Structure formats: structure tokens, C-alpha cells
Design a protein around this ligand. Structure first.
Ligand SMILES: N[C@@H](CCC(=O)O)C(=O)O
Ligand SMILES: [Cl-]
Ligand SMILES: [Cl-]
Ligand SMILES: [Zn+2]
Ligand SMILES: [Zn+2]
Ligand SMILES: [Zn+2]
Ligand SMILES: [Zn+2]
Ligand SMILES: [Zn+2]
Ligand SMILES: [Zn+2]
Ligand SMILES: [Zn+2]
Ligand SMILES: [Zn+2]
Ligand SMILES: [Zn+2]
Ligand SMILES: [Zn+2]
Ligand SMILES: [Zn+2]
Ligand SMILES: [Zn+2]
Ligand SMILES: [Zn+2]
Ligand SMILES: [Zn+2]
Ligand SMILES: [Zn+2]
Ligand SMILES: [Zn+2]
Ligand SMILES: [Zn+2]
Ligand SMILES: [Zn+2]
Ligand SMILES: [Zn+2]
Ligand SMILES: [Zn+2]
Ligand SMILES: [Zn+2]
Ligand SMILES: [Zn+2]
Ligand SMILES: [Zn+2]
Ligand SMILES: [Zn+2]
Ligand SMILES: [Zn+2]
Lengths: 88, 87
């Protein structure tokens, strides 16, 4: 949101606050799904490989949201926190 | 999208047979709403549910593989084409 009444300074701070696409990963997933048989050990290896991209993506998402939280005023943080409850 | 594939009645029954949470949000919330970003704590949060994620993914991928294999040649081409166009 869009719920927080962001000052123009804050939105510039935010714009400034905001690796490779997990594409070869999807390819390996495709090959597991399209196979004549299910290969559990190969699937486990794909899951484990996906954990490294997920870690990167989660760390980036949490760090971004943390830096945004800390440009907010007390009133805005309260609204941010309420909104966080309301998703999903 | 498996339903977009003109499933036969037999396939609908086969899929039926084949097919036979906030505690983690709260930890993310604690990491986000802090006056500093604690990367060590975040990495531990991210890793906590690794084994449940694995069990869930494995079940999904196996279910997907099972459904893919009841498709006809035509249906598989449609599914694979849609897969290429997505994500
Ligand atoms: N709220 C503190 C807890 C202490 C710690 O984890 O070091 C932090 O996120 O850093
Ligand atoms: Cl793909
Ligand atoms: Cl929460
Ligand atoms: Zn305001
Ligand atoms: Zn307002
Ligand atoms: Zn600037
Ligand atoms: Zn592939
Ligand atoms: Zn593909
Ligand atoms: Zn391939
Ligand atoms: Zn292939
Ligand atoms: Zn294959
Ligand atoms: Zn194997
Ligand atoms: Zn295993
Ligand atoms: Zn195992
Ligand atoms: Zn990796
Ligand atoms: Zn970085
Ligand atoms: Zn950084
Ligand atoms: Zn408020
Ligand atoms: Zn107010
Ligand atoms: Zn308000
Ligand atoms: Zn808690
Ligand atoms: Zn810690
Ligand atoms: Zn810490
Ligand atoms: Zn394990
Ligand atoms: Zn165990
Ligand atoms: Zn099984
Ligand atoms: Zn069949
Ligand atoms: Zn064809």
C-alpha cells in the first residue's frame, strides 16, 4: 500500500531501496515432470538446488522490506504492521 | 493448466485417484519490523522449514509426473508448450 501516506522523500528513499532468473531451474523441473518415470533422488537434488535461489530471494525480500519499514514514521509503521497481518 | 487440456472422463477419475503455516509469517514479521536487518537470524528463518518444503515439493512433483503420464501425445504437447510460455 498505498495505505501509508508516503511523503515524496520517502518514496524516493523507497525507489532507491528497490540473482539470475531461476530459468535453468525450471528446465530441470520440466524434465522431472515430463519423464516416463518419477526419479525421487533426482527430484531431491532439484529441490535442494532450488533452496539456494530461494535463500537469495528471501534474503533480498526481507532486507528490502526491513529498509522500508525503517524509513516509516511510528504511525506509518503501525499501519504497515496491520497490513502485514492482513496478507494473505 | 491440466484442466485446459480437454480431459476425458477416464482421465478425470485417474486424476481424482492420484490426488487422494502462519508461525513462519510471524518469524518473517519479526525480522522485517526491527530497526536493523539481522541476516544471521533471517538465514535461520529461511532454513527452518526446509524438510517440510522438501516433503511438499516431492509430493507435488510426483503428482504432476503421474498426471503428465496419463495424457495423450496431443495433450502432452499442449502441456509442454504451455510450460514453455509460463514463468
Ligand atoms: N532483535 C534483535 C535480537 C538479538 C539478536 O538476534 O542478535 C536482532 O534482530 O538482532
Ligand atoms: Cl521450462
Ligand atoms: Cl505475521
Ligand atoms: Zn500519514
Ligand atoms: Zn491516511
Ligand atoms: Zn536520493
Ligand atoms: Zn528442461
Ligand atoms: Zn521446458
Ligand atoms: Zn530439458
Ligand atoms: Zn528435455
Ligand atoms: Zn523428460
Ligand atoms: Zn535416478
Ligand atoms: Zn530421500
Ligand atoms: Zn529421504
Ligand atoms: Zn545451489
Ligand atoms: Zn545485497
Ligand atoms: Zn545489503
Ligand atoms: Zn497508524
Ligand atoms: Zn493519522
Ligand atoms: Zn492510518
Ligand atoms: Zn511469534
Ligand atoms: Zn541471530
Ligand atoms: Zn542476531
Ligand atoms: Zn532431511
Ligand atoms: Zn529428519
Ligand atoms: Zn508415491
Ligand atoms: Zn491414459
Ligand atoms: Zn500434436
Amino acid at each position: 500500500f498505498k495505505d501509508l501516506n508516503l511523503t515524496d522523500a520517502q518514496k524516493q528513499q523507497i525507489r532507491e531501496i528497490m540473482k539470475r532468473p531461476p530459468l535453468e531451474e525450471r528446465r530441470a523441473m520440466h524434465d522431472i515432470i515430463a519423464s516416463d518415470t518419477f526419479d525421487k533422488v533426482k527430484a531431491e537434488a532439484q529441490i535442494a538446488k532450488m533452496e539456494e535461489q530461494r535463500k537469495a530471494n528471501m534474503l533480498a525480500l526481507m532486507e528490502t522490506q526491513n529498509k522500508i519499514y525503517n524509513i516509516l514514521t511510528p504511525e506509518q509503521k503501525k499501519q504497515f504492521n496491520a497490513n502485514f497481518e492482513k496478507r494473505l
